[PDB]
Design a protein around this ligand. Structure first.
Ligand SMILES: [Ca+2]
Ligand SMILES: [Ca+2]
Length: 144
């Protein structure tokens, strides 16, 4: 409200911490009201936090175009993206996951405008039962 942009994850800056800007741009050819839960974790200690995007109603190609900032230990922490279909009266159906490291990533240049670029990541099953299709379009960069 007085905060336009929150930083999640580590609650203070240390020598070994950076802020990563995660753009959750779109889902492409998903298997329908999708959102993405973005979980920040450490292999040794498990989940630090998670943030959920808005839900896009009735779409197999949702354009969330949403940014989330996390304060992280870039060489230690990882991100798990899980896409779900929000169901009002039952369990939300799983539409796939992507799991990525947080180093190396480009650092933003404060003097220049952030260019639009992206990478597509194939969505993966979470069990033999998952029926998953398509890609998650993302961009991750460090703040100066
Ligand atoms: Ca639904
Ligand atoms: Ca539900």
């Amino acid at each position: 409200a007085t905060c336009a942009v929150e930083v999640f994850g580590l609650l203070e800056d240390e020598e070994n911490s950076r802020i990563v800007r995660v753009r959750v741009i779109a889902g492409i050819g998903l298997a329908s009201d999708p959102y993405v839960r973005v979980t920040l974790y450490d292999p040794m200690n498990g989940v630090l936090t998670s943030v959920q995007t808005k839900t896009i109603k009735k779409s197999l190609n949702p354009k969330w175009n949403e940014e989330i900032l996390f304060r992280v230990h870039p060489q230690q922490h990882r991100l798990l993206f899980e896409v779900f279909d929000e169901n009002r009266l039952t369990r939300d159906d799983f539409l796939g996951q992507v799991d990525v490291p947080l180093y190396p990533l480009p650092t933003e240049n404060p003097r220049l405008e952030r260019p639009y670029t992206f990478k597509d990541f194939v969505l993966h099953p979470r069990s033999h039962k998952s029926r998953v299709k398509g890609y998650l379009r993302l961009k991750m960069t460090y703040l100066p």
